[PDB]
Amino acid sequence: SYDRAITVFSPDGHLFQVEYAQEAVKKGSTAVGVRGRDIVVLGVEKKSVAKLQDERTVRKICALDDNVCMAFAGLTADARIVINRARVECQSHRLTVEDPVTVEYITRYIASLKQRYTQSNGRRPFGISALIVGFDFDGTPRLYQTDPSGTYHAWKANAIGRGAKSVREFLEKNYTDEAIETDDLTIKLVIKALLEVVQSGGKNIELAVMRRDQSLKILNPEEIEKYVAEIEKEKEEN
């Protein structure tokens, strides 16, 4: 039918298989990322704290390059493939151009790969949405979001996966220049957004911090719990 073949256009003009890939993305766990002054931070809500499992092997936030990060929401295997391809392309660009990879360049490459996989009906689209965030050569913070269709958009603050809409409303309501100015403010904003996403929070918070001229580092559960306690104290004060 119209909804079974990727290449077939629906009478309305839809490529329903791309939209089904988007639905698969929505099925994934929530990933939230905001942009700040010389501070870019990512956050992914873990679906469940599965005991007897190594958290290192199921991380959702990875580093494409020393100056670029990426978080995904959707099929994990597709995300791994896209991440490997993005890393390879980043190194190839650093080889051929000798300059550090811009966030725009890698975001465009990922979008092009996803669109190319959407081209033919033999290949299914990648069912992932990626939040590529990092610093450019000049150090300007950059946040971007790609879709299975192959469209990339810059965002000041975005959320993908399940419950993305509510977290996006939260961010829109609580995005201010003062919050962006302070790195701790941005981190607290992301903690609050993810806590809104998942009531339990705490151990389920998977937050990563990247600052100017500093490699990606993932805050340990101790720091995440400290920030959660700070948010709880602030709420109690009110």
Binding site: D66, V88, R94
Partner: protein, 197 residues
């Protein structure tokens, strides 16, 4: 033509190289750095035929950085040396040989310091100290004479200075400046360049 040198100590590997890039009879560049940063603990001293040097060094460097990005941990100096030897041999056997002389130096938290010698035929060989170029002939004798397995960092720098003075005294080509770097457990530290005005 281009001179490389490497001295391995109990907990460090001292390496140095001349800074002369000459075309025909003129030194086009007098501050040409021949050290390539493989990773935070590995250096690749590469000399050879014009474009082969830069191309091969950068290719291996990007491969090592890709390994770091994908796995999250750096290649061991032995692993990096073996990977470089494999790629160099594969390219040499193929229709695009790379005429590059390599001197890989690195420090491992488990194995410790390591210096690796490689010729353009991709014959790997770990040695306590080694050199490349026509100055190796004049300097390996001094290294053999004055090298001690438990040689201090300052004594290693003194031996390097002796080698460079011999190069100035006897080597036909002028090599006034040498870039000197050391690799410790704390990382790669750039030392003051030894200059002979």
């Amino acid at each position: 033509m281009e001179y490389l040198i490497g001295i391995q100590g109990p907990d460090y590997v001292l390496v140095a190289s001349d800074r002369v890039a000459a075309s025909n009879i003129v030194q086009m560049k007098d501050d040409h750095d021949k050290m390539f940063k493989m990773s935070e603990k590995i250096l690749l001293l590469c000399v050879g035929e014009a474009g082969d040097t830069v191309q091969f060094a950068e290719y291996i460097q990007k491969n090592v950085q890709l390994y770091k990005m994908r796995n999250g941990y750096e290649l061991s100096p032995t692993a990096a040396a073996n990977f470089t030897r494999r790629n160099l041999a594969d390219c040499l056997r193929s229709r695009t040989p790379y005429h590059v002389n390599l001197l890989l130096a690195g420090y491992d938290e488990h194995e410790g310091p390591a210096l690796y010698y490689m010729d353009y035929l991709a014959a790997l060989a770990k040695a306590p100290f080694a050199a490349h170029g026509y100055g190796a002939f004049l300097t390996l004798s001094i290294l053999d004479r004055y090298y001690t397995p438990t040689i201090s960092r300052e004594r290693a720098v003194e031996l390097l200075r002796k080698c460079l003075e011999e190069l100035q005294k006897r080597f036909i080509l002028n090599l006034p400046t040498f870039s000197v770097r050391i690799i410790d457990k704390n990382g790669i530290h750039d030392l003051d360049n030894i200059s002979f005005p």
